[PDB]
Amino acid sequence: EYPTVNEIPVGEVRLYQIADGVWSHIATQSFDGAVYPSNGLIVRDGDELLLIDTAWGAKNTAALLAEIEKQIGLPVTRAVSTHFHDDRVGGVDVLRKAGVATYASPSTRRLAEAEGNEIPTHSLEGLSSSGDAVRFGPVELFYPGAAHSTDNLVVYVPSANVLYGGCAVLALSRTSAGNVADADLAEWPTSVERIQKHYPEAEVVIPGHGLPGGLDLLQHTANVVTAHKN
Ligand SMILES: [Zn+2]
Ligand SMILES: [Zn+2]
Ligand SMILES: [Zn+2]
């Protein structure tokens, strides 16, 4: 029942309910000759919402806000981008203009600036080194170490044991490590191991692109990245 890339035209956004007050959002985008799906998260924060990642671009993110209004009907007040690529920060300006407080680590902000991407405005403190974790409303933010990018964060929702891996975690469908332009292939398996050790009770694991699954998405990722690296 999870929305697939084949089912979502570019410009449309789907929501998928994972638990009471937890949704993923799914969008698609034209990239490097293909159409890719992309996931983010929505977590209820009292009578407000916390958004994890944009929907990969301004038009997609505007559609996301519209979809949230008609499906959930609570305001997005804060957003966190989990690394500096456009599928995570592309749309930050739309969010900011809509009244949303956009957040990222200092590293992500720096890298977004350097890449010419939109820059989340507010800085997350306490995430500078491997293994660091902080609470942020209804979620925990965790820096597992460099992986898909040097700055990538993962997000855990303890109310539902939902682990949002973002792009540091690969879907089972991936046969390569994907876009590795900014990746640390040497560190990535160790960073996955940190996630495995810190979140052993995760029920659901959501990758940055493609279908959610269980904990074996983590070991899958380590396996693919190690094979790639070799
Ligand atoms: Zn990325
Ligand atoms: Zn602000
Ligand atoms: Zn990605």
Numbering used by the authors: 32 to 261
What does the paper say about this structure?
VIM-5 and VIM-38 belong to the VIM-1 cluster and differ from VIM-1 by 5 and 6 residues, respectively (Ala130Lys, His224Leu, Glu225Ala, Ser228Arg, and Lys291Thr, with an additional Ala316Val substitution for VIM-38). To explore the structural features contributing to the observed differences in inhibition of the VIM variants, a crystal structure of recombinant VIM-5 was determined to a 1.5-Å resolution (P21 space group), having 2 molecules per asymmetric unit. The overall fold of VIM-5 has the canonical MBL αβ/βα sandwich structure, with two zinc(II) ions (3.5 Å apart) being bound in the active site located in a shallow cleft formed by the interface of the two β-sheets. The proposed nucleophilic hydroxide/water molecule bridges between the two zinc(II) ions and is positioned 1.9 Å and 2.0 Å from Zn1 and Zn2, respectively. Despite having identical sequences, the VIM-5 L3 loop was closer to the active site than observed for VIM-2, as was reported previously for VIM-4 and VIM-31 (19, 32). Comparison of the crystal structures of the VIM variants reveals that replacement of Tyr224, as in VIM-2, with Leu224, as in VIM-5 and VIM-38, likely provides a more spacious active site that may better accommodate the bulky tryptophan side chains of the tested inhibitors, as reflected by the increased inhibition of VIM-5 and VIM-38 by inhibitors 1 and 2. The smaller side chain of Leu224 in VIM-5 also enables a “flipping” of the main-chain carbonyl of Ala231, altering the entrance to the active site and likely affecting inhibitor binding. The replacement of Glu225 with Ala225, as in VIM-5 and VIM-38, may enable more flexibility of the Arg228 side chain, contributing to the observed differences in substrate/inhibitor binding. Additionally, the hydrogen bond formed between the Glu225 side chain and the main chain of Leu265 is disrupted in the VIM-5 structure with the replacement of Glu225 with Ala225.
